[PDB]
Amino acid sequence: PSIVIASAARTAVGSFNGAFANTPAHELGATVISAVLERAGVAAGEVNEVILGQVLPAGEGQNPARQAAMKAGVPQEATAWGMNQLAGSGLRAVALGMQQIATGDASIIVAGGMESMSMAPHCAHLRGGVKMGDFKMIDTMIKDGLTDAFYGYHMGTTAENVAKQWQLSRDEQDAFAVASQNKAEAAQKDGRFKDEIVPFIVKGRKGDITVDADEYIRHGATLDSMAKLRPAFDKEGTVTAGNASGLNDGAAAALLMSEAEASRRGIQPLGRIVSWATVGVDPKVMGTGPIPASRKALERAGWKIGDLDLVEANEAFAAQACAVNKDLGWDPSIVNVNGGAIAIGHPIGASGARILNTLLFEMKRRGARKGLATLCIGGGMGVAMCIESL
Amino acid sequence: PSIVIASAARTAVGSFNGAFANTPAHELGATVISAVLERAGVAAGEVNEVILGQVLPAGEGQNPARQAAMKAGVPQEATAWGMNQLAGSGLRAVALGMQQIATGDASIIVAGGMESMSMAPHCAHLRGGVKMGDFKMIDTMIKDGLTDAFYGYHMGTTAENVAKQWQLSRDEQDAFAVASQNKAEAAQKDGRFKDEIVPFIVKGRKGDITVDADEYIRHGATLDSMAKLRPAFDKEGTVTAGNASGLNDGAAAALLMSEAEASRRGIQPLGRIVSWATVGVDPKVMGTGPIPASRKALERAGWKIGDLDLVEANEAFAAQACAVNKDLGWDPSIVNVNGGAIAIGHPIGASGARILNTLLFEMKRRGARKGLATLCIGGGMGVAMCIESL
Amino acid sequence: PSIVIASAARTAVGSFNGAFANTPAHELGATVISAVLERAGVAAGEVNEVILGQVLPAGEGQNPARQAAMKAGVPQEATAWGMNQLAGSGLRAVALGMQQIATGDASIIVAGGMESMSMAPHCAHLRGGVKMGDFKMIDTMIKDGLTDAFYGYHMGTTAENVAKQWQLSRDEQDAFAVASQNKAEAAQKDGRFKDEIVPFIVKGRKGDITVDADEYIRHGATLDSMAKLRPAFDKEGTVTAGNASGLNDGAAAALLMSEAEASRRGIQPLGRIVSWATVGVDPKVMGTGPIPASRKALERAGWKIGDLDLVEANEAFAAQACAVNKDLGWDPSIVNVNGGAIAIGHPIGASGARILNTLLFEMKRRGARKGLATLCIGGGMGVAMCIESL
Amino acid sequence: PSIVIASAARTAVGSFNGAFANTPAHELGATVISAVLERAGVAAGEVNEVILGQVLPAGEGQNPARQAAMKAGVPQEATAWGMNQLAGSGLRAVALGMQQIATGDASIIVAGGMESMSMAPHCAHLRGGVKMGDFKMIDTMIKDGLTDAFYGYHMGTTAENVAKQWQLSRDEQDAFAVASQNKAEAAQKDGRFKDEIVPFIVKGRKGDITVDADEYIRHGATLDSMAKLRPAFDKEGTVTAGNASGLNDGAAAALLMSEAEASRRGIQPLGRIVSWATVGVDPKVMGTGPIPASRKALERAGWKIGDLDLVEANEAFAAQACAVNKDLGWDPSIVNVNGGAIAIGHPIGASGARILNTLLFEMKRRGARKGLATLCIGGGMGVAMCIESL
Numbered sequence A, B, C, D: 001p002s003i004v005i006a007s008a009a010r011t012a013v014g015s016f017n018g019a020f021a022n023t024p025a026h027e028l029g030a031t032v033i034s035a036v037l038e039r040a041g042v043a044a045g046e047v048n049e050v051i052l053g054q055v056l057p058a059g060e061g062q063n064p065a066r067q068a069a070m071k072a073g074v075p076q077e078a079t080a081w082g083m084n085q086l087a088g089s090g091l092r093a094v095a096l097g098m099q100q101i102a103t104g105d106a107s108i109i110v111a112g113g114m115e116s117m118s119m120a121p122h123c124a125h126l127r128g129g130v131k132m133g134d135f136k137m138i139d140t141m142i143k144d145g146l147t148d149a150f151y152g153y154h155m156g157t158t159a160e161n162v163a164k165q166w167q168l169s170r171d172e173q174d175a176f177a178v179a180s181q182n183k184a185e186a187a188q189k190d191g192r193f194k195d196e197i198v199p200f201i202v203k204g205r206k207g208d209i210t211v212d213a214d215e216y217i218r219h220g221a222t223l224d225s226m227a228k229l230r231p232a233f234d235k236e237g238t239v240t241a242g243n244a245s246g247l248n249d250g251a252a253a254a255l256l257m258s259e260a261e262a263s264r265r266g267i268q269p270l271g272r273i274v275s276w277a278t279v280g281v282d283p284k285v286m287g288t289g290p291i292p293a294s295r296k297a298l299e300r301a302g303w304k305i306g307d308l309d310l311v312e313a314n315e316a317f318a319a320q321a322c323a324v325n326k327d328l329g330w331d332p333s334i335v336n337v338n339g340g341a342i343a344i345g346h347p348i349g350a351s352g353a354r355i356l357n358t359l360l361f362e363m364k365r366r367g368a369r370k371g372l373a374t375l376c377i378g379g380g381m382g383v384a385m386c387i388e389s390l
């Protein structure tokens, strides 16, 4: 089996309670679904299944993947499901879809992720009844997204642990963050994100608004402004809101089919999926996940690390990002060339399809042959995928 | 590629706010994961991944499937993820596991489902705030489990749609339900759930309790107690509390590996998976999903309906189940031989694994060579899987 | 001016989530208003104002006093208002009614209090929105009723403060508590609450229930059952659920007019109000409020402590009740002759009026000439009223 | 007894979720208490009681009036209590305060009201429990403040009832409303609210903000702006957001003592309370309440309507204000000379004190000898107070 990405698309990443503050994930989803269909010239009638990574579905109704697909125009006869491996989710969905094709179960799959961290509700278990006493309304975004289920503290605390292990100074984390911002503002301005982004129309009462730019990138980001910030978790620590990514909203998708199918339709694919791997690590240092993941995927692809021409490695925190780069030893000048999530944002279930978008379109534009996408995963996991240009 | 269910276990299904009223899904999940390992004689450290269907994860912490796997002693090295195709989630998880092993990405998978409908919280989106006026706190079990996203109404209203299209009377669904209650009562007393069920220890403060029996089945179920119930959804309707399944809690799972590996380990498998399928249908008549999904599966196995020795066809509603039997035309004496969900319970994300567990242990008990398991899915889909004993 | 109490009534006192669990305070209020009118031979058309103490009006609608008055058939031309001096409220309401008559602003007032602790809601401020992080749903009963606003701790902690300053042992508190129960039981069995109580009909769907007995009084209370309880507020503390009053529902009221008006009508009044007083104390030892208030009220009446024939002093906690008795030195045999709040219950806003009811019917029964009613108030206050028989 | 108002003060009236959006009512209250004291040259140690009207206390903690008094430095020996007769509260507190002094129960009282509509929580009764389905989180400001308890509709509907009975056109209402804005604007710019307002410091993390000006008054209000609005309550109705008052925060108070005590201390009082009255009306036309109350107060004073030099009549709705003016026949040019609540706001429990404040400082400024303050009250009441200058 030879499976290709025929097309891909993503929304802009919206800031917490910004452009997409009242926009449900399945609407962002539906827009990306329509985009990948139109970009490859495949009708929505020909899609067999839609697979979407989503971490925070509380309150959005039955199977939001099926809602995304129906709104996109996919017919009732196809199928649609969601899945959750946290930040890994959106890239893992892409691997799952490839498997559907490889085992002769489907011809054409749309896979990716969607998230609205904005729209995540607060909740409380209330059936028994609260006879006496205050009770907590729990923020589901914090509880289901950002808190370790075993140790009970924030993901940023695991970033703290990774920093300590690898002895990464505050100045090393800030300098990395300022580079990711500077790279991102540069790509934005030079038009390097227009290709991958499909504009979203936010319908309203007193006017439609078109959103086509990443609103979380901060312009003119400087080391001095990074150095002014207070530590955000450990009170004499090194992780801040400046060297960690944010809470964001968006969606992203790819259309997969067999190489042969693409050639029958005259489609020029963005890449062939050569290998993928998922691996587990200690949850206290979950940011190490991408290391055994990226190395296992490379092993499956039969490739050496120096064979890679481009990498996209999710930047949840500057700490885990510096460490991952240090261990694997690949050339920093080929990693996150258009910036990473510290700058662009981290819409969790979507992020893995997001970075895959960035990779595929950058690989197309510089003529790169081989690349890899990798992310760390809360609870101690990593996921990775190798991509080769045709 | 030939993939087999080495082993399988489920919990008793508990009634709503009943035995597992304060038990999170991942604990019921950890208990079945450990039982599949034990029953097979496989060490937890040999498990590559745990895949669990779960529909209602709100408030349960990051990646509940990872929480289940970790409490069951599966090492940190392994991976876990959750997925949602509503009531088909648990069956689909098994197929996804199968796929992991057939694409050469894994050796040993634990797959199934888990659900606590009792532990599901109420929620509201409150980030923008509520400037003025009343607002609703939403039941996430109804909103995310039992309400159609497209038309707005309860799943029982779809069952009513199918009762009118297939012209099924209230005496025909009442007859169906009592028969299911009688079949499930006779099975329980006969000892025929003992093998599949693993006891679960409810940890309390004033005493542990060991749950090893389904508590939702009602004994001595009469047609008159059925015929004295007012309709739940349509006031001139046929669907009532008694001819529809309940709200339940439980978990259900299966250990997957290749046939060659089952033989190297000296494991005699419960069955070989031969084909599966999912298909979509008109959401208004979602209960019909199992018709095309069973047909596609049966065709992907090269089988005729006639070949089948045993079928488990989830009874969400008597209306949908009466209708599926009518269209397919298999012998109703080989369907849900030990009762159905009307009797037993319908723990949504878990139900598809549940009915697989009953199918496998019954097929072994009687000596049946071929089995089909199938379920309808909210939003309008079906899933099915063909099993063959060795 | 001389103001009399022409008539008085109270409902039975309901247990927390017991007989009155779903009855709003204003329906209790209305039954008592009707009763005081009937008992005096005064028509509702003659009432000028209704004044009701009430601590916990949240969720009850606009001005519950007006709702109570209107339901009892008091004409729209009358006025009605609520007030809050915490447990002082129902007694203060009577002094405020007496003031409207003394200043010539009204002729006939109904005053007292009403409280539904069971029907108190939980609440949160949600207008600004909750951008990120958990929030508490606050129990309004605990927050508005039972928590000190200055120090942040439960009223039971101020009882601990008093026990420590007055060196009152757990043994002494428990004996006081068991004596309260035993006196209240005896009084109930002997019929001594019959006169003061007006029966309340709790309307239902499957039948009405009449409630005319205090349900919180525990029959056969033992010293062993007080002695086994654990401290409720301080782990080396002495105050327990046994030697504190409970959380309760009820209403109580009195009909006030000038002495000259009672004589024109041919009414035999229950008592003349001779004096009242309210004084502040340190919040930390609020249970001491009755000391300065009783002494002030006695000064104003021109009476010595030894002149009193009967005293009702509210027993919020055994600790403060004991301290009050010690400081004042009145003969304990004339205090709370029929038990107090430890046994009967403490429906906050109604209690001041409840104990006045008990005092007036007992004075009448035994022919006592001079009486005092007093209560402590959260936030550090005391209220007292001197009554003389005619 | 002759009782005088020695001094008075109010905060600026804040807009809904505006300047006081996170300021509890008791904080606003404490500032006004300190101000009346400072203005009269009376020490906090001399105050016997504080009486504060307040409609919406839910969530604020035990007895907010005590909390306000304590914050202002009134000694623990003094007493404090809240009351609620709706928009009547803040004026009625003054009359209650006058009564304490007239019956010789106190010498120095601070009386007024406070309200934070912004801080009013949402609530639900959750004790019994919510077994299944959605439930309502009720806005306490609307339920307890603005909804009639007998008919279930907004106060705005009662305004429509009045407009209908009195045949008041939309253009007459919109003219009154624009006049009220234009008079308030003029008075604000001329500095006529300076004397009555005490500045409130809103303590902020990143800077304090001093609030000394009424923020709800619209500058340059046009008739065309009123004329374009949609009816707010009845779809062919006449009452709009423009010709109704708003939802607002504020506090207001007066220091009261005997005329002879003022003389001893050398205080030139703002006024002598000559009479007061409260009367009920039909709830359906509650806006007519000022008519019978103002006539009763004038009767009790021995004054004809034409003896009055200045009137303050609260403007809940233009409709009722117009009705009141037409029935009473007072010269409209002496009524609400500096604008009314349509322009300044309506902080419910504080409103009656706010209008008293305005009346006293205007009477002083122009040398008017005879004044009257009156307001309508939800549930069908009126309150009125007559003042004479010394």
Ligand SMILES: CC(=O)SCCNC(=O)CCNC(=O)[C@H](O)C(C)(C)COP(=O)(O)OP(=O)(O)OC[C@H]1O[C@@H](n2cnc3c(N)ncnc32)[C@H](O)[C@@H]1OP(=O)(O)O
Pocket (backbone or CB within 6 Å): A087, A145, A146, A155, A156, A218, A221, A222, A225, A226, A229, A232, A240, A241, A242, A243, A244, A245, A246, A247, A286, A316, A346, A376, A377, A378
């Ligand atoms: C495997 C995984 O994927 S784990 C990853 C999952 N995602 C996460 O864990 C998210 C991690 N981040 C978070 O949880 C949150 O965004 C936090 C806690 C770090 C920050 O949240 P907040 O406390 O609300 O920080 P916020 O975004 O407001 O920033 C704080 C201040 O720093 C400023 N700031 C941040 N970055 C910069 C910068 N580069 N330059 C200058 N100023 C900056 C902001 O403007 C802000 O100022 P303000 O509050 O006066 O307006």
Ligand SMILES: CC(=O)SCCNC(=O)CCNC(=O)[C@H](O)C(C)(C)COP(=O)(O)OP(=O)(O)OC[C@H]1O[C@@H](n2cnc3c(N)ncnc32)[C@H](O)[C@@H]1OP(=O)(O)O
Pocket (backbone or CB within 6 Å): B086, B087, B146, B155, B156, B177, B181, B218, B221, B222, B225, B226, B229, B232, B240, B241, B242, B243, B244, B245, B246, B247, B316, B317, B346, B376, B377, B378, D132
């Ligand atoms: C794709 C899919 O899978 S769609 C399927 C998804 N599943 C569902 O939608 C679940 C459908 N069922 C439901 O929603 C609910 O069970 C309902 C609304 C139908 C009824 O449940 P509830 O409203 O919570 O009521 P409850 O479970 O307490 O039972 C109601 C009454 O019927 C009685 N009852 C129900 N069945 C029977 C029976 N077979 N014999 C005798 N009595 C019965 C109960 O004992 C109870 O009686 P009571 O009022 O005298 O105490």
Ligand SMILES: CC(=O)SCCNC(=O)CCNC(=O)[C@H](O)C(C)(C)COP(=O)(O)OP(=O)(O)OC[C@H]1O[C@@H](n2cnc3c(N)ncnc32)[C@H](O)[C@@H]1OP(=O)(O)O
Pocket (backbone or CB within 6 Å): C087, C146, C155, C156, C181, C218, C221, C222, C225, C226, C229, C232, C240, C241, C242, C243, C244, C245, C246, C247, C286, C316, C317, C346, C376, C377, C378
């Ligand atoms: C000025 C003023 O007014 S301040 C006063 C205001 N009012 C108050 O502060 C009320 C004080 N009391 C309270 O707040 C509460 O009732 C508390 C916290 C003390 C106890 O509340 P709860 O959690 O409902 O405890 P609860 O009433 O169920 O009692 C606990 C146990 O003690 C037992 N108990 C209580 N009294 C007795 C007794 N006399 N004999 C035997 N057992 C007893 C109960 O039966 C119960 O037993 P269980 O746990 O085995 O079932």
Ligand SMILES: CC(=O)SCCNC(=O)CCNC(=O)[C@H](O)C(C)(C)COP(=O)(O)OP(=O)(O)OC[C@H]1O[C@@H](n2cnc3c(N)ncnc32)[C@H](O)[C@@H]1OP(=O)(O)O
Pocket (backbone or CB within 6 Å): B132, D087, D145, D146, D155, D156, D181, D218, D221, D222, D225, D226, D229, D232, D240, D241, D242, D244, D245, D246, D247, D286, D287, D316, D346, D376, D377, D378
């Ligand atoms: C006896 C008694 O005391 S009963 C009195 C008790 N109080 C009440 O009953 C309160 C009555 N008022 C209310 O309930 C509310 O203020 C309402 C329902 C009338 C309006 O409230 P809201 O829903 O928040 O509407 P809002 O105040 O935003 O006004 C709506 C629009 O009209 C506009 N508007 C308001 N006043 C004016 C004006 N004078 N000129 C021009 N436009 C105006 C606003 O700017 C707003 O425009 P926008 O939303 O595009 O920015």
